[PDB]
Amino acid sequence: MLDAVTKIINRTDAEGRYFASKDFDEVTRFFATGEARLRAASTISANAASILRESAAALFTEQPDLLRPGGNAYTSRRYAACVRDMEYFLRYATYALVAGDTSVIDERVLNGLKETYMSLGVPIPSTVAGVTAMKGVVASMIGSEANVYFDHIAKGLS
Amino acid sequence: MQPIILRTLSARRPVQGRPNLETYTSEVERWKAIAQTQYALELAKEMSRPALRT
Numbered sequence: 001m002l003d004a005v006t007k008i009i010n011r012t013d014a015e016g017r018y019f020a021s022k023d024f025d026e027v028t029r030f031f032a033t034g035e036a037r038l039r040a041a042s043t044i045s046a047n048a049a050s051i052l053r054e055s056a057a058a059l060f061t062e063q064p065d066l067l068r069p070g071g072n073a074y075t076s077r078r079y080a081a082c083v084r085d086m087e088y089f090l091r092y093a094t095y096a097l098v099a100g101d102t103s104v105i106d107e108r109v110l111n112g113l114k115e116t117y118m119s120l121g122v123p124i125p126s127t128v129a130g131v132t133a134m135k136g137v138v139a140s141m142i143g144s145e146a147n148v149y150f151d152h153i154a155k156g157l158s
Numbered sequence: 159m160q161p162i163i164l165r166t167l168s169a170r171r172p173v174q175g176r177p178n179l180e181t182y183t184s185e186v187e188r189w190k191a192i193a194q195t196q197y198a199l200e201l202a203k204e205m206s207r208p209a210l211r212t
């Protein structure tokens with residue numbers, strides 16, 4: 001997969017040129033923000049259970065119809081699948097935050113997710129509501145460092 | 159006519175044949191390689207340019 005540094009390397013290699021001053025400034029900016037990004041990623045990892053608990057509660061308080069019979073989150077199995085998908089979103093958001101790039105979300109998460117949900121009848125707007133709830137819960141904990149990755153997942157899903 | 163006049167004096171050069179030039183030939187090959195390298199650098203710079211950006 002790709003992080004920011006590999007993105008810069010790939011760009012320069014496709015141009016067939018050595019790194020220049022601008023590319024070095026870009027990679028230094030990446031190295032500068034890296035430590036804050038690891039702190040955010042470690043905090044998310046340590047508190048992942050709490051984040052899932054709060055975000056699932058927020059989603060199912062916003063939309064109580066999902067849990068009632070006939071809803072897409074009505075069973076132990078469909079509820080477990082739902083919280084599992086939120087777990088996926090958080091884990092891959094942490095990956096993207098460490099990488100500094102969203103291509104891992106496009107490849108491992110978004111590609112085929114719309115068709116999976118349409119095939120199964122998962123309500124995509126409600127899943128986006130869940131991603132937004134997770135974004136708020138996570139921002140309440142680490143700040144605004146992971147906002148762009150959740151926004152990426154939300155745009156890709158919608 | 160009675161002075162001693164010397165008509166056919168031997169030359170300095172020895173009777174032997176020309177010495178082989180193998181070492182000189184190798185050193186000229188080295189200079190040719192050095193000269194070839196600098197033009198090869200220009201053509202190699204041309205080789206690394208991107209594909210369809212004319």
Ligand SMILES: CCC1=C(C)/C(=C/C2=NC(=C\c3[nH]c(/C=C4\NC(=O)[C@H](C)[C@H]4CC)c(C)c3CCC(=O)O)/C(CCC(=O)O)=C2C)NC1=O
Pocket residue numbers: 060067073074075076079
């Ligand atoms: C039809 C099949 C089906 C099952 C079996 C089912 C169980 C179930 N119970 C849940 C929450 C819950 N479950 C309990 C029950 C516990 N409270 C005490 O600790 C007791 C020891 C114990 C019950 C005897 C409580 C209080 C909650 C809500 C609080 C929470 O989020 O943990 C949830 C999460 C969604 C929600 O908040 O409603 C599920 C999916 N749901 C289903 O659709």
Ligand SMILES: CCC1=C(C)/C(=C/C2=NC(=C\c3[nH]c(/C=C4\NC(=O)[C@H](C)[C@H]4CC)c(C)c3CCC(=O)O)/C(CCC(=O)O)=C2C)NC1=O
Pocket residue numbers: 066071072073077078079081082083085086088089108109113116120122123126127128130
């Ligand atoms: C790593 C990236 C990745 C993602 C994102 C992913 C999503 C995903 N969700 C699935 C099912 C599901 N996903 C959901 C979740 C929905 N329920 C709604 O109420 C919510 C709004 C919403 C979640 C927030 C549900 C209920 C199912 C079960 C659907 C069914 O079997 O009918 C399935 C089918 C496999 C299964 O039955 O567990 C996939 C592949 N899989 C992946 O490998």
